[PDB]
Structure 1
Amino acid sequence: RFLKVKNWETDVVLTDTLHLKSTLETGCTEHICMGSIMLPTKDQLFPLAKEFLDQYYSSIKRFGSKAHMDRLEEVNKEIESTSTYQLKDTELIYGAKHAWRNASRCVGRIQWSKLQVFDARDCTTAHGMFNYICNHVKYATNKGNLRSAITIFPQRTDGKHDFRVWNSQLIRYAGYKQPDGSTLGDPANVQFTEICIQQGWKAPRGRFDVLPLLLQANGNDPELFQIPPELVLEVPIRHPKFDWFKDLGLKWYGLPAVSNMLLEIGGLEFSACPFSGWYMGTEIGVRDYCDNSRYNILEEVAKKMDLDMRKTSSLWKDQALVEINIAVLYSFQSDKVTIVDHHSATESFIKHMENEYRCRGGCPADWVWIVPPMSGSITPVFHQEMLNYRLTPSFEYQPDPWNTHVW
């Protein structure tokens, strides 16, 4: 099978054959596309394991070898008597780097292979989980020069001894809903912040309060911990020309670390696998700062810019939005903290994508997510057609822990 993909800005056409190895569903059918929808056992386990192992050995150029077969049999036997199996270190690294390589919503996959993997499978407690996480945060932050990483905790067994990190990200500001009706801090975390207070945390009720980690180990009740403040690198936001900007009182954290997702390798599930890399400007300046549902800072910034906010046709929101992002990129670069803008990031992804086609025969990509939330059509990925499909190993969403935990 061959599927064509054209870039209408360079006319370059690529052929996709990788989609043939697609396994899971998309949510779409022949009668309806759901492209813009946020989120649509022993016998089960062995095929998946086999599939994975074949992939691995095929990648190392030992497909069929005795080694291959031995492992193939070893795993089989193991699943036969234990109802599961453990991944050799090498396969875990591959498994992880590849779940990334397949993240159809990640624009920065050009860096997929350069990933630091921390095997946290020997962990057994929340305190243990806390030591690991602290080590991960430190390695990755690296004094401003970020490095990609992921710490993987014990894999699921019976689902009743699940390891979970209740935060959505290792680092995020608390959200407090006032009687006033408004919301202080990050609206997006209002619920979680509540659960922290409810568990004991003592909220400083500030605008940018670094939430506490709520770690759950072996299925037991989650415990709270405070990331060592000296480990949380933050950048104060200032404009390269608006000296009044700094008076906005804006700051953000430099380490983006998604922690609420689930990593699947060879049929195995890792309900706790925090991973970090680095930010693309717009993430903070466009979505976090300007989304109506977040810090919603357009009004202010505009006012302080003295623009005709009387009529929408003045594009005051557009003018402000560009300035707010200049500031973000400016700040980070000035404090020498890693960060990439939407122009570089997207250009990169195009090269990567081009490489992925020649080397792998494709690159699953979710356009709705790859294209930045600003200046869309002036980034090359806008004019780039993309095919979306799911490949394992993979990163998946999973129910919020509080909505499923048997206390």
Structure 2
Amino acid sequence: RFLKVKNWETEVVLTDTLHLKSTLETGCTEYICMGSIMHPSVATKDQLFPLAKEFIDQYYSSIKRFGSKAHMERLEEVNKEIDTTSTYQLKDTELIYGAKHAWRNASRCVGRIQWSKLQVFDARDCTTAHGMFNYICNHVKYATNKGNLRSAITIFPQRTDGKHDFRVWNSQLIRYAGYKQPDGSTLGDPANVQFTEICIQQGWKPPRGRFDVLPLLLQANGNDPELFQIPPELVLEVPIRHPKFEWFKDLGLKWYGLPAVSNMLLEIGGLEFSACPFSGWYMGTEIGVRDYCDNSRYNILEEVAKKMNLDMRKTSSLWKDQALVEINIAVLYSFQSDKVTIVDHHSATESFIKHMENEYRCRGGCPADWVWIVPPMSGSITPVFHQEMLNYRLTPSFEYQPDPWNTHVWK
């Protein structure tokens, strides 16, 4: 059946037909909704063929050639390859289409208006961790583009037997280290304390600073991972200052310009790309709200409210909310002053509503996760707060996967 979504501010109603084409589960049932659960819970020739067939079918439907001679040949081509080799290889055109549509189907991504402008780097000929490092450096250099950031994904060889996996062990390509101090506290980024310990334990010489770029830790073909330092001229960073508060620069805050998720799994046509680092540009709140002001991250709210001279004795002064707005003004001002691409949550959510309109008209829907789409501050003064959304799982897709250090049989 058709489903309607209403925007309660504009009264616009859209009609979702696209959800009828999903087949993966959400985790909800008729009686329990798991919409706020962050993670709700190796193929064979038998499982693999219908998945391949479905993906080839939708690809040739997208290029307006369904049932063509090319379509029929590809289906037969893929048939004997799965049969004779227990897997199959995507054509270049299919790889690019599959990566763009995995972005397009990412229900948690507010940046999807850009989905078809994605640079795809085919790295399926990679065999070693040195090769992976070379591919990753080129990605970072291309996507950074001197501050005019460009969306990119680099796709390493697919999973075969589960024993020869390609994995980027870093959760993101560029992150700051985290150090557990003698006096029990934490220097740097606390969310990376464990990973930083694994890099130290592998030979990394930590400068033990507050913003130390972590080395890369790269696993090729199931071997033990190897450390590599990204050349510093490739790591673009932004000193954070405030347009009105000249004391803000004295806080000593910086961040990196390139957000690049490297720990997810790209599923296309039943194939699993366990190493597929992808990157875009930041929404300001990612840095200013979550990275800086989470109690479990850099946790700077009290310090800023200190130099703002705010009364911090009771919650109802909203001192936290005041300091939060100023932190996020500075992040946007800093990136913009340095001509590094960044989007504020007002522009981003507005673009996403426009994206939603587009997708409903030309595609019949747009899967979207309100819990992730609504920004972590000022929710209801952004237009996505008032937008009903339907969440469902379409393929090709990005999926979560286990941390590699919980599964890697060392040697």
Q: Report TM bin, short chain.
A: over 0.9
Q: What CA distance in whole angstroms lies between the structure 2 residues aligned with 1:60 and 1:334?
A: 42
| TM-score, length-scaled by structure 2 | 0.99
Q: What CA distance in whole angstroms lies between the structure 2 residues aligned with 1:267 and 1:45?
A: 6
User: 1:191 maps to which residue?
Assistant: 194
User: 1:226 maps to which residue?
Assistant: 229
SS in 2 for 1:15: strand
CA offsets 1:296-324 (integer angstroms, 9 cap, x no match)? 00000000000010111110000000000
User: 1:207 maps to which residue?
Assistant: 210
Matched, 1:380 2:395: no
Q: CA deviation at 1:61?
A: 0.4
The match for 1:395 among 392, 398, 405 is 398
Q: CA deviation at 1:145?
A: 0.3
SS in 1 for 2:342: coil
Q: What CA distance in whole angstroms lies between the structure 1 residues aligned with 2:183 and 2:397?
A: 43
Q: CA deviation at 1:179?
A: 1.7
Q: What CA distance in whole angstroms lies between the structure 2 residues aligned with 1:174 and 1:6?
A: 44
The match for 1:53 among 53, 56, 68 is 56
Q: CA deviation at 1:218?
A: 0.5
Report runs of 4+ in structure 1 exceeding 3 Å deviation.
none
CA offsets 1:184-234 (integer angstroms, 9 cap, x no match)? 100010000000000110111100000000000011000000000000000
Q: What CA distance in whole angstroms lies between the structure 1 residues aligned with 2:21 and 2:49?
A: 18
Q: CA deviation at 1:250?
A: 0.1
Matched, 1:96 2:106: no
Q: What CA distance in whole angstroms lies between the structure 1 residues aligned with 2:165 and 2:331?
A: 38
Q: What CA distance in whole angstroms lies between the structure 1 residues aligned with 2:370 and 2:208?
A: 38
Q: What CA distance in whole angstroms lies between the structure 1 residues aligned with 2:23 and 2:408?
A: 30
Q: What CA distance in whole angstroms lies between the structure 2 residues aligned with 1:173 and 1:406?
A: 27
> Mind listing any 5+ residue stretches in structure 2 that lack a counterpart?
none
Q: What CA distance in whole angstroms lies between the structure 1 residues aligned with 2:243 and 2:163?
A: 52
Q: CA deviation at 1:386?
A: 0.2
Q: What CA distance in whole angstroms lies between the structure 1 residues aligned with 2:91 and 2:316?
A: 60
Q: What CA distance in whole angstroms lies between the structure 1 residues aligned with 2:23 and 2:127?
A: 33
SS in 1 for 2:8: coil
User: 1:216 maps to which residue?
Assistant: 219
Q: CA deviation at 1:282?
A: 0.3
Q: CA deviation at 1:20?
A: 0.5
CA offsets 1:62-83 (integer angstroms, 9 cap, x no match)? 0000100100000011000000
Q: CA deviation at 1:389?
A: 0.5
Matched, 1:26 2:29: no
SS in 1 for 2:187: strand
Residues 221-300 of structure 1 mapped to structure 2, 5 A cutoff: 221-300=224-303
CA offsets 1:40-89 (integer angstroms, 9 cap, x no match)? 01110000000000000000000000100100000011000000000000
Residues 303-322 of structure 1 mapped to structure 2, 5 A cutoff: 303-322=306-325
User: 1:332 maps to which residue?
Assistant: 335
User: 1:4 maps to which residue?
Assistant: 4
User: Which stretch shifts more, 230-239 or 19-28?
Assistant: 19-28
SS in 2 for 1:117: strand
Q: What CA distance in whole angstroms lies between the structure 2 residues aligned with 1:137 and 1:119?
A: 14
CA offsets 1:357-382 (integer angstroms, 9 cap, x no match)? 01110000000000000000000000
Q: CA deviation at 1:136?
A: 0.1
SS in 2 for 1:224: strand
SS in 1 for 2:255: strand
CA offsets 1:327-381 (integer angstroms, 9 cap, x no match)? 0000000000000000000000000001000111000000000000000000000
User: 1:158 maps to which residue?
Assistant: 161
Q: What CA distance in whole angstroms lies between the structure 2 residues aligned with 1:184 and 1:143?
A: 29
Q: CA deviation at 1:108?
A: 0.3
Q: What CA distance in whole angstroms lies between the structure 1 residues aligned with 2:160 and 2:144?
A: 32
Q: What CA distance in whole angstroms lies between the structure 2 residues aligned with 1:256 and 1:116?
A: 15
> Mind listing any 5+ residue stretches in structure 1 that lack a counterpart?
none
Q: What CA distance in whole angstroms lies between the structure 2 residues aligned with 1:2 and 1:23?
A: 16
SS in 1 for 2:5: strand
Residues 86-165 of structure 1 mapped to structure 2, 5 A cutoff: 86-165=89-168
Q: CA deviation at 1:39?
A: 0.6
Q: What CA distance in whole angstroms lies between the structure 1 residues aligned with 2:172 and 2:305?
A: 30
Q: CA deviation at 1:23?
A: 1.2
Q: What CA distance in whole angstroms lies between the structure 2 residues aligned with 1:247 and 1:23?
A: 53
SS in 1 for 2:303: helix
Q: What CA distance in whole angstroms lies between the structure 2 residues aligned with 1:76 and 1:293?
A: 50
Q: What CA distance in whole angstroms lies between the structure 2 residues aligned with 1:376 and 1:327?
A: 19
SS in 1 for 2:359: helix
Q: What CA distance in whole angstroms lies between the structure 2 residues aligned with 1:195 and 1:406?
A: 15
Q: What CA distance in whole angstroms lies between the structure 2 residues aligned with 1:56 and 1:406?
A: 37
Q: What CA distance in whole angstroms lies between the structure 2 residues aligned with 1:17 and 1:158?
A: 37
Q: What CA distance in whole angstroms lies between the structure 2 residues aligned with 1:136 and 1:330?
A: 26
SS in 1 for 2:172: coil
SS in 2 for 1:201: coil
SS in 2 for 1:114: coil
The alignment's C-alpha RMSD in Å is 0.4
Q: What CA distance in whole angstroms lies between the structure 1 residues aligned with 2:312 and 2:37?
A: 33
| TM-score, length-scaled by structure 1 | 1.00
The alignment of Structure 1 onto Structure 2 pairs a total of residues equal to 407
Q: CA deviation at 1:38?
A: 0.7
Q: What CA distance in whole angstroms lies between the structure 2 residues aligned with 1:223 and 1:105?
A: 32
SS in 2 for 1:358: helix
Identity in percent: 98
